[model samples]
Target: SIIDQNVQALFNEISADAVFVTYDGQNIKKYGTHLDRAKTAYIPASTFKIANALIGLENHKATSTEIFKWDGKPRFFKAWDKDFTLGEAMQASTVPVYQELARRIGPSLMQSELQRIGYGNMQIGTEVDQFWLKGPLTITPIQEVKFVYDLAQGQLPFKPEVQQQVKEMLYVERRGENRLYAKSGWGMAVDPQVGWYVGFVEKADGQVVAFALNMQMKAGDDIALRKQLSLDVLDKLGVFHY
Candidate 1:
């Protein structure tokens, strides 16, 4: 078992029960309080944007630089109420823009591509635009790590450039020669709520480790904790230097 006491202490600090998993395209490791939860599926939330973005690009629904002019409506996140390119919308987690992209990708292509990628449970509920956000479309932490690891390695079932574009869309931050790519999600509509931080790191040493963290959230604070907790766990595992 890769569970480390120090990693658990990181989760304990926030009073959240989480399941975190890591993969190096070789060895897969698990950690946290409830190991079983790592395999339990839950709504993917915005993290699905990673896949959604890829689907849009593969279908030529939008070029990476094509602008998505905002509809000028108020939104949950103020950052979203403006014009954005595909990459910018990804960084902003602009829901409406992606929802529009989903509509363009359409149900037939969306369903077929998801099946080709073998993502999560491959379940698309009645509403294609909201399935990943609300319910029916679910994914486990283990499944998330696997999908991201494949994406990080440029092995997903899409044109290499298409996969590369999505990977670039997730660029988070860098420490020296090391680069971190990730996305966070808040399944706020669900009872007890759920939070996610999923992505991979490109270490200067030439090792890439993909990770996923999904935890039960109690309050507004967890929106940030989803990513912070994942970082702390990766740091505790010595994946890279701070």
Candidate 2:
């Protein structure tokens, strides 16, 4: 396939295995070109924020500008010390902010919601706050793409308004007339380390293309490569032509 050659050539430049999937409101396409390294499950990392945001909004947990006063506990990053709303939390990817919310939602309800959406393993583990990170939750690149597609299309079991709120929180960048939303994650401390840049493209004509890329990586150094790899793949597909 032409796409395979283009993507495969670009992928040859990387040291890690990359898996990419795109859903263009019609078909689901894979970009293994050469990314088929196991095609196994990997932690969602910060990408879990999307689902967390959806659950919070669906239950009226918080609003766009509503503040989540930081717990006042010292953290690894100073930027995470201040209070934050759902939007700020999203942008900063402040883990504690969402963790508290997850603790508020508790395990049972969290598992229920995860199941309803067919999230990977659908397990919240013993500690609700750490499950998606340090616990049992895991997902594949293809599944991650589908999850975004379903959420964007209101195919998930949630209020359209809830999905809308979460979608708004995911806004990454905007082109001349098109909007691009995405979430990037890096989980290097865990086994089978993984990095992700998953979200969707909203065209001016209202067409939607959802995508997910999960790649093998180690150390924080691979983080940038993960994002750059996805951009390279998208550019190859001519997604940014608009």
Candidate 3:
């Protein structure tokens, strides 16, 4: 499959310590040795917004059009801009909106939703709160691939309505056609920098294809590198027609 070839090329070119990719229904493709021992528990960063949106909407914490005021001052190291609705915040990856939304939803609720949805490995801290932001919100390539596959199969931890809302929120914007839905994460860590993009594409035959790509790179470097790499891999896999 093109997925295999493209992923292999990425592993070679980037010299990535680990790499994995899976389509709608398939076994995982893995490259690199230390990947097994590599921490599956890393802070999810903005990627957790997808889960937050699911939990929030499921619990009636917010609505799609509910507008949130950008009250907090822009943090010295975080991105906080103008006010935003839930949909807009998700589409644009606004941190202030998500952080506030997370606080409002509360940790107990988040934990219950995650647990219900089969995110068993996820751990929530009491004092620190923001469990999604903590270091151990980890995922292995094997587990990530399986999660995407299961989500495609309608086996996630959400009711149909809640799942549909998340799917709609993650829906990718295509100029003339309905495309995929996705969320991305980028941040710094102790050793290597982290980059992640997760989402799915809908095919003409009514099948949904999902994928997740995560990378570890040098700190202080451009994060878009992973996005470009993902696009290149997709192009090679013939999954995306440009």
Top candidate by lDDT: 1
Q: With candidate 1 superimposed using the best TM-score fit, by how many Å does residue 200's alpha carbon deviate from the native?
A: 0.6
lDDT, each prediction? 0.85, 0.79, 0.64
Which model, 1 or 3, shows the larger lDDT? 1
> Per-residue lDDT of 116-223 in model 2, one digit per residue for the tens?
878877877798988777758988787888888887677788888888878888887777767778888877558877778898888788778888987767765644
Candidate 2 accuracy as TM-score: 0.93
For model 2, the stretches where C-alpha displacement exceeds 4 angstroms are 37-39
The predictions' CA RMSDs to the true structure, in order, are 1.7, 1.8, 3.0
Segments of candidate 3 deviating more than 4 angstroms:
1-3, 31-39, 76-79, 127-129, 148-154, 175-178
User: Model 1, which residues run further than 4 Å from truth?
Assistant: 1-3
- Which 10-residue window in model 3 sums to the lowest lDDT? 30-39
Q: Which is the better candidate, 2 or 3, if ranked by lDDT? A: 2
Reference-based TM-score, model 1: 0.94
- For model 2, which pairs clash? none
